[PDB]
Amino acid sequence: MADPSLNNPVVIQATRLDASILPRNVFSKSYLLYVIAQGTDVGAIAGKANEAGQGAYDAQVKNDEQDVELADHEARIKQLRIDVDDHESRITANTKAITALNVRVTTAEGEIASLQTNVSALDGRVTTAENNISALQADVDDHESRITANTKAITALNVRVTTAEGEIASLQTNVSALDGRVTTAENNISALQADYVSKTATTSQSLASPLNVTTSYSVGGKKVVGARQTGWTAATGTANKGVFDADLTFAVSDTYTQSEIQAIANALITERRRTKALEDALRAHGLID
């Protein structure tokens, strides 16, 4: 460290030299040009050897407050170094984060503006949709208000069709019924014209049957027959269908002749028998009783 002894003065120098008292008798002048000078030189060398060690201590005691402030330095540096070195790994790490973050920010911002245009695209896409759906519900509303009016007038014309369809058969069975009714009538009229007598024809009409009339038969507007006459007694006798002559019963004379009255009586007999068979006619027919 330091030496304090250095700072301890040796100065003595007990005595200062004078002559007297020294053998100035036994000495040459020159030993006295030495012995007084030797004493002064010895004493000046001491004080100088003393000052040499005062300054040697001051230089030693400075070196000891230098080494103490060297050692305070040596420490303040090492903790300044251990600090920059740790600050180093810490900044090197702080940037390493900033650089691998900005990449997380860039991958974000890039998807967002993509997401931004992948959003308002879907909004546009649903607006087309929305506007369609509403029109589709505008048409379906019109379609429902129509189909039903179609169904309603289909029912309304079906009840007019099934009516006529059943009235058609009514007429069609009225026509075929009247068809049989017409043909038998026209056939009965054809026969009725064949078997009937007309007030209008000359062509002689032949009955297969007897005839009856109320009062008189007639021709030309004159009465030709009447009721069978009454009151008759039937003439009996012999009916003469033989020859009949109108001759004079003659020879009537002035004298009685038997042969003529015999003729007149025989021209009576035979005249009565015509009138008898002329009566046999009017009876057989029935014109008289």
Contact partner at residue 194 from Ca ion, Cl ion, a copy of itself, none, CB < 5 to 8 Å by partner kind: a copy of itself
Cβ atoms of 238 and 273 within 8 Å: the answer is yes
Considering only residues 13 through 32, tell me which ones interact with a copy of itself, judged by CB under 8 A.
13-15, 17, 20-23, 26-28, 30-31
The region of 40-48, 68-76, 150-158, 213-221 touching Cl ion under the rule CB under 5 A is 150-158
Tokens, residue 61: 């005691």
Q: Is 68 in the site for a copy of itself (CB under 8 A)?
A: no
CB of 261 to a copy of itself, least distance (A): 5
Hey, how many other C-beta atoms are within 10 angstroms of the C-beta on 144?
A: 10
Q: Is 95 helix (H, G, I), strand (E, B) or coil?
A: helix
Spell 179-214 as b/e; 16+ CB within 10 A means b: eeeeeeeeeeeeeeeeeeeeeeeeeeeeeeeeeeee
Size of the site for Cl ion (CB under 5 A): 4
The region of 23-31, 61-69, 72-80, 210-218 touching Ca ion under the rule CB under 5 A is 61-69
CB of 243 to a copy of itself, least distance (A): 5
Q: Is 140 in the site for Cl ion (CB under 5 A)?
A: no
Q: Is 188 in the site for a copy of itself (CB under 8 A)?
A: yes
Cβ atoms of 239 and 277 within 8 Å: the answer is yes
CB of 283 to a copy of itself, least distance (A): 10
CB of 22 to a copy of itself, least distance (A): 5
Considering only residues 68 through 97, tell me which ones interact with Cl ion, judged by CB under 5 A.
91, 94
Considering only residues 139 through 168, tell me which ones interact with a copy of itself, judged by CB under 8 A.
139-140, 142-144, 146-147, 149-151, 153-154, 157-158, 160-165, 167-168
Q: Is 102 helix (H, G, I), strand (E, B) or coil?
A: helix
Considering only residues 207 through 266, tell me which ones interact with a copy of itself, judged by CB under 8 A.
207-229, 231-233, 235-250, 252-262, 264-265
Q: Is 63 in the site for Ca ion (CB under 5 A)?
A: yes
Q: Is 230 in the site for Cl ion (CB under 5 A)?
A: no
Size of the site for a copy of itself (CB under 8 A): 223
**What is the rounded distance in angstroms from the CA atom of residue 140 to the CA atom of residue 130?**
15
Distances in whole angstroms, Cα of residue 12 to Cα of each of 44, 55, 132: 11, 19, 130
Distances in whole angstroms, Cα of residue 210 to Cα of each of 193, 213, 228: 21, 10, 16
The region of 66-74, 108-116, 166-174, 220-228 touching Ca ion under the rule CB under 5 A is 66-74
Hey, how many other C-beta atoms are within 10 angstroms of the C-beta on 95?
A: 9
Q: Is 130 in the site for a copy of itself (CB under 8 A)?
A: yes
Residue with tokens 């940037």: 95
Distances in whole angstroms, Cα of residue 214 to Cα of each of 32, 51, 285: 252, 224, 18
Q: Is the peptide bond before 20 cis (omega within 30 degrees of 0)?
A: yes
The region of 58-66, 108-116, 150-158, 163-171 touching Ca ion under the rule CB under 5 A is 58-66
Q: Which of 8, 40, 54, 66 is in the footprint of Ca ion by CB under 5 A?
A: 66
Residue type, 277: A
**What is the rounded distance in angstroms from the CA atom of residue 283 to the CA atom of residue 194?**
36
Considering only residues 191 through 210, tell me which ones interact with a copy of itself, judged by CB under 8 A.
192-210
Question: What residue ranges bind Ca ion (CB under 5 A)?
Answer: 63, 66
